[PDB]
Amino acid sequence: SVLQSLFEHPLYRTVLPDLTEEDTLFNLNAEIRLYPKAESYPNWLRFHIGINRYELYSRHNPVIAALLRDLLSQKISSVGMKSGGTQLKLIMSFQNYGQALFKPMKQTREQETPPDFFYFSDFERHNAEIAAFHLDRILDFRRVPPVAGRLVNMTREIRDVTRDKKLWRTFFVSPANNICFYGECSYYCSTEHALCGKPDQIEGSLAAFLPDLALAKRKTWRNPWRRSYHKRKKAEWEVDPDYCDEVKQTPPYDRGTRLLDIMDMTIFDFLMGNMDRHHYETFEKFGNDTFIIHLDNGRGFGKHSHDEMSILVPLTQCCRVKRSTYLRLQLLAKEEYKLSSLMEESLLQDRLVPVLIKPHLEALDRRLRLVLKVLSDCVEKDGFSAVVENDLDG
Amino acid sequence: SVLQSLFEHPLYRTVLPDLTEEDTLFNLNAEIRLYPKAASESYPNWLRFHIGINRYELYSRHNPVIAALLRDLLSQKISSVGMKSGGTQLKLIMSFQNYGQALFKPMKQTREQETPPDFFYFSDFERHNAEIAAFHLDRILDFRRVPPVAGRLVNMTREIRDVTRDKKLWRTFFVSPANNICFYGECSYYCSTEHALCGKPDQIEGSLAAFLPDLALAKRKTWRNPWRRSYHKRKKAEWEVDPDYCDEVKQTPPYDRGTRLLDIMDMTIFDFLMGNMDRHHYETFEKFGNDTFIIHLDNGRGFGKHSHDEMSILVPLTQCCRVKRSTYLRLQLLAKEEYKLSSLMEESLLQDRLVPVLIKPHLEALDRRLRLVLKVLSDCVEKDGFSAVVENDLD
Amino acid sequence: SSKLQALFAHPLYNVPEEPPLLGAEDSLLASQEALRYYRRKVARWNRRHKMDPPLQLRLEASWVQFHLGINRHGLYSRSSPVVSKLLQDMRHFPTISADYSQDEKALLGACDCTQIVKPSGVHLKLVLRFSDFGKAMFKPMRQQRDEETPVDFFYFIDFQRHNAEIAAFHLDRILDFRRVPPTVGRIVNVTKEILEVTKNEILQSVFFVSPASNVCFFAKCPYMCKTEYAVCGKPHLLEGSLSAFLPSLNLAPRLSVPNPWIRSYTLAGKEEWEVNPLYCDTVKQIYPYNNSQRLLNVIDMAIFDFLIGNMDRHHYEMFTKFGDDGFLIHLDNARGFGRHSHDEISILSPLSQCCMIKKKTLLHLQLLAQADYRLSDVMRESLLEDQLSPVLTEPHLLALDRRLQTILRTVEGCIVAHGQQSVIVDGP
Amino acid sequence: SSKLQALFAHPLYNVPEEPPLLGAEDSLLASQEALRYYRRKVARWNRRHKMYPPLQLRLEASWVQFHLGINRHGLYSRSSPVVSKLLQDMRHFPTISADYSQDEKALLGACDCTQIVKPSGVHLKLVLRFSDFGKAMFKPMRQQRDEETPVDFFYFIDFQRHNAEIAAFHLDRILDFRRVPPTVGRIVNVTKEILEVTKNEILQSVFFVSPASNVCFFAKCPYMCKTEYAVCGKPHLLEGSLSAFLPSLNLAPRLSVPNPWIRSYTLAGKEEWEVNPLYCDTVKQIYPYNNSQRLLNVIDMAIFDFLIGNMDRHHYEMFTKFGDDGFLIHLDNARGFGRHSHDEISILSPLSQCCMIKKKTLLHLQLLAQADYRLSDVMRESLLEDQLSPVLTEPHLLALDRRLQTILRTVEGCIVAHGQQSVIVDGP
Ligand SMILES: Nc1ncnc2c1ncn2[C@@H]1O[C@H](COP(=O)(O)OP(=O)(O)OP(=O)(O)O)[C@@H](O)[C@H]1O
Ligand SMILES: Nc1ncnc2c1ncn2[C@@H]1O[C@H](COP(=O)(O)OP(=O)(O)OP(=O)(O)O)[C@@H](O)[C@H]1O
């Protein structure tokens, strides 16, 4: 009912402007040329061809719904470990030639990140990845790749279906007669952080794979509010209160769509508490006039009794937002709609519920009202039209 | 005779200015407290080497320890061997019977071989030849910015394989169909079976670069070279399109003072003499400030091509056009037939249990690359004039 | 003069082969069905690239007649004018398309720098298409002529020589085995004939320019693991070996069968045959080697590999239409011809241990030992008709003679232990 | 009331111990020699610290009297007033110096993140010096009180709890084994009492400030490998366990002896004793376990480790002056007291398989099973004298009683198979 009514609002039916062959990503006939000899195409393909300039997927797509179902139950064909990342992330291949990223459980639901942990020491948890997709979907941003949670068997779906010599040599059985593995990444890839089931089921998230970087090159931008990632040493945006007045003079931040896009993202990161947003990818073939893919969301939902205000500093220094999002954020604050009842609704449709313990679902509204207040406390000092840029003209 | 005469020149006896406790690196009594209880100047040579690192030089001109420190690396007993992580290619850490340690870069490639012309600067091999050659080259120019390194014929059975508790390094020790012993390790560049290092049948050869003092009591700043190559195919670099680059880089906070820039000039001349186009970073010593030399580390990418002079290394000099008068007079002196570089370099390189460390074409190319550096200083001092190209150092 | 002409004019290379071919059921490709399938793929190809007149599928094309000419007696005909045209076409016809081929591509990923023997899909090879619509497997030059596989190199890390793929074909033709696909050498303009015709977005990404200003390309996975280098032109010219494509698996399905004499493919460890001289006593009692006709075909393959020094024969492919008695396809021979100073007798283990050889095979071997038609001279001459001549250096050619003696010595050697009863199988 | 006073006022804890001590040769430290050596180290400390009133070495100091009070009968005396002062001094005396200790430091390097069982030198422990010149091994708090070693945790990756080192001392005192060094709990200002007193340049580098504004420090190697975290104060206060320092190895050399019942220290694989119930039949015929007196001391160590659940007893140290019959030092007990719900009977393997226990040891165990002097109550009360009370949670204390029954049941259990002849060794 709650979710039924939200998409029934007149703020969620605003169609994108028309398109053009320049706004498509690639000629579908050229992605079928990268795969072996093998609209009946698999859902991961209908997902890829639908990635246009604005949204990553249509509002109420029938494939995005079914794409989540495939990852839940499709058969695992091959499993491989990724290299070069922060923490352990595995690449899954399926019976339909589709692939996906996989981040395991790593930590429980009722646990909070220790207060003494730096932002670059927090765990990447499947909870955040799955919750981030629904959160982004609820805000009608559609900038996250679909991710679904699955109860995987670490015997037949992990160990016995990998030819990776590194990953397999870490599969040991613990004194509790449980099966464990840790891999060979760099953070928390040792015996003392081994991931174990009881006795052989591990749980995790399957983030759908973005199209191959060969025919869908992705730019990678450095966040101007990127933390220094170094103890003791401070950061630039943490000492100049007018930072945004200098960052709106850079070549790509005095145009767009941009700045506003960061705003749509920095509001997103604050709602989750994800202070690990140091990079935001794009799509290159489009130019400087597209959305930002919200990737690597696993560091959110780590603290429910705490609201990290440092994430909001991009907004408190820039003080401007997209009118589309402002009216939504207000709408998402009314008791008839709101975030908790809307978030536990869609999150209830996953073979992992409860993906978010109740404190996080409730904290979602608390972080929302602080964002809404930061917009109010600032629109009284800069005024409307100079804080909200009309986009809904159409 | 030539080397004897070179140090007998009046251009090689210029002493450093006076010192001060602020110019020392650390108070000796505080490094001896970091090592175990162990089993007046009878301290090992690697320790006498560390306490001598002052603000200006890394070691006195004619030290009796730097000579003896080289001898230790040649013959001291190997205690433990461990593989380093995070580097470009394979580099092993050696520990000795006297608690001293050193870096170790193996042979990897022969002497008469040249870097393939189709290899990028970031695909070139790191060879022990270059590391040892760089030290004498730097010593001969009286720069004294490189850690001492000496070459040693090591036994891969008792000095490598049988004295390491490293599970990664040891599990790659296989015997080849030619009944030779090989190992490759687990780094990132050329660390696979198809680049395995093998002896005939169990001696591998390599270089031992002495270990700089522990970063705990001797923190080292790490600066990014403004002429750092893009390290990316197709994509160009800033200094490769703006011919006035130096006029913008002499306005940055640390390059419009010093000593600096001049330090870079002393270094970019060094890298050109070797052909080392992998100079993307230059470390310092933090506890001193912005008023010290630059440690010339990771020199293994030089001496890869003897029939080629990579002019791109000189671009820092052709765009900045200024040098230290101390080095200018030396570089002129090192081009004279009575002194010169080849005869000076084959002299000192002859004192190593690895000679010939440099095949003869490289030793002779040293004079060829030097005269081009000498000419670039001449072709530019006619367009900017002396006093505005050479900065007075003595008085 | 011309020992090559004397060889094929010998009564041996002219007697009819038994059993004779009734037709229809002895040609793996059905004429009416195959022409329809190739005609659809020409139709399907003409679009994809449209999205000059369109392509025309002519029966007179070389690869078409080659595919329809594959019979139960081998891949091609004895002294076939079709193959002579087929070889000339692959040398001169312009390229219209370039891809990554299967066997790769289906890897999706898949680079494991820890894997010592990564699968045969992470190897530098392309599939080219010519104006007559035919295809050919392209293997580039990876080593000089006077270069050997260096000592300390196991078989699974040995190179992939183009000239071996060529010479393996001529040796197949001289032996009248008629089992490897025709292969020619050709100099390729890698920009105009590979890069400018490829529609694969990945393949365009692996082409760069060297500091020497040469057009180079590489295999994606081996370059990442830094196990191999790139392959550059000078600056555009690069020589390679095109191996004619077998018929489509939709028309003639194939069956990759593992060899009984595989290697360990490890840095240590030996297989059962490497230690037990009685290995074939077990093999002779395992289906489908119990019929004593499949085993003989493996013996020939062993002889052919020992002549070229191809230790890497883990699997041999067969056409399913021809049954257990069908001949074996010797597809990827690019590893042989790497050691001209060494002869690996372990390759000859099937003949050494089973001790039985086909009548026809022995007669062709004995003949090639006589100076009037010695194996080195007829190969040296046959290889001159290729653009890449000389494809084999002198030590390699003479090595064939010495390796031929070793085969003959083993036959007569183990005849003393079993007699001509069980060492010569004069089946029809 | 007070069962603890009743324990030490019992005739068992008052009978003279045999053989009696003649003196001189039964005190491991010679008085005149020890006082001279300790006086020089005080002289050298005053010089070397001045360069970086002076210290006075008084005979009346606690650690001095403790060191000269170590006899052939144990580390300390039965109900010793020295130990009561020694505990109080380590709790209150200010710190004057902090270092990294040996055993580390001598690692030089040495972090191998692949090593699963890295040496016992890469563990967070410091050596503190107090105003009376004495030293003590500091182990910081690494886990809450109500926290267990989680299942799926092998012994070699178990934590390093401070409260276990303390409780292990009181259990040593309650059993009248008198073998572990005295240990007290103390709240430490990690800034004022560690960082501001260390001359070690590395130790100053591992101190940082949390996002919660807490002074934290860490072990250099485990933090790099991300196998463990840092240890923060709130914001400066942190509790740990100080274990009194043994005399200098220049005065009383020690001998690290490997246990006969070591563990594999691997993710799989078992040792010989883990599989062979007749393992001790082999041990009884190996020197120096043939005298049947060293083996008895190992039995006691097994009892003490089983009571606390200390599986990590790979080596036991001995004083070389006391010979093969000398007592064993139970130095590092920081791993015990981690499982209050689990009893690891493999620790009891020496008593299980050898089936022989010392007469004195059995009487103290039997006594500690009676409600008038039960092991949980006398521990609970003895541990109240520590600033870190409660040092053991309620489940841990009650576990001592239950595990005591398992030891007693094991004695009487294997008595039926051997009789009181070979299961009670009433040596003098
Ligand atoms: N001469 C040869 N040398 C090595 N490999 C070969 C040769 N000829 C064919 N092959 C192998 O046979 C396979 C042919 O299968 P392929 O996917 O090309 O089917 P196809 O014939 O293209 O079918 P379709 O007509 O449906 O496209 C290739 O992957 C290739 O590895
Ligand atoms: N209570 C204890 N618990 C654990 N280990 C201890 C304890 N007491 C001493 N040790 C060990 O004993 C060793 C003491 O030797 P150390 O290097 O301190 O010599 P020292 O006694 O200081 O001699 P010197 O007076 O010459 O300095 C340390 O390595 C320490 O690990």
Author numbering:
A (entry chain D): 134 to 171, 197 to 552
B (entry chain C): 134 to 172, 196 to 551
C (entry chain A): 89 to 139, 150 to 526
D (entry chain B): 89 to 140, 151 to 526
Please quote the paper that reports this structure.
The human genome encodes three Fam20 paralogs: Fam20A, Fam20B, and Fam20C13. Remarkably, each has a distinct biochemical activity. Here, we use a combination of structural biology, biochemistry, and phylogenetics to elucidate the molecular functions and evolutionary relationships of the three Fam20 kinases.
In an attempt to address this discrepancy, we solved the structure of the Fam20A−drFam20C complex that is crystallized in a different space group. A four-leaf clover-shaped tetramer is clearly present in this structure, formed by two Fam20A−drFam20C heterodimers similar to the human Fam20A−Fam20C heterodimer shown in Fig. 1a. In light of this Fam20A−drFam20C tetramer structure, we realized that the absence of a human Fam20A−Fam20C tetramer in the crystal is also due to an unexpected obstructing ATP molecule, besides crystal packing effects. In both structures, an ATP molecule (ATP-1) is bound to Fam20A in an inverted orientation, as we previously reported. Given that Asn298A is at the center of the Fam20A−drFam20C tetramer interface, the bulky glycan addition is predicted to hinder tetramer formation. Nevertheless, both mutants activated Fam20C at levels comparable to WT Fam20A in vitro and in cells. These data suggest that while a Fam20A−Fam20C heterodimer is required for Fam20A to enhance Fam20C activity, further assembly of a tetramer is dispensable for activation.
